[PDB]
Amino acid sequence: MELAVIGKSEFVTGFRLAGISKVYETPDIPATESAVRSVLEDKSVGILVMHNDDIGNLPEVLRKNLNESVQPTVVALGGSGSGSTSLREKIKQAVGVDLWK
Template sequence: MELAVVGNGEFVTGFRLAGIRKVHEANDNELESTVRSILEDPKVGILIMHENDLKKLPEILKLKLNESVEPTVVTLGGTGESSNLRDKIKQSVGVDLWK
């Protein structure tokens, strides 16, 4: 499984420098189509997005991303709570690793 990152140029630059290969730079107009194409890629196990970009997506797509196990969607930045990552890990692994 691979990591994929979607976001604006400023957000994705660090991931490129870290060596992640599936980095998709997308502006607001391209965001929805880019996320949909990543959801269809069977090689992607984790999708990383900025929380503000997730909020820009249509409600139906946000619901699909929140319920998605593969790929697991992890949001960074914004006003997200640390429990969000905990819930995502619990959802994908099946156990609460913090206990």
């Protein structure tokens, strides 16, 4: 298997040293499509790894599409990491309105 990564430039410069890790650089959200063209075929070659720091830009666009097209191993970095959530509640009694309705 090969090593495919999609992040910044400085990222590829680090791995390029050992030559044992192919990393890309997608500074712009639109330019990302460029690297995706080479990944569409290099996705089933080994392990893939991207950075949500650029992918997140396309939620309902990418995150949504890949959500079901996540065939290969797209290791996305970031996105969640370590955060929290929330909750809610109702009144219940409100249902009484459905009685008169």
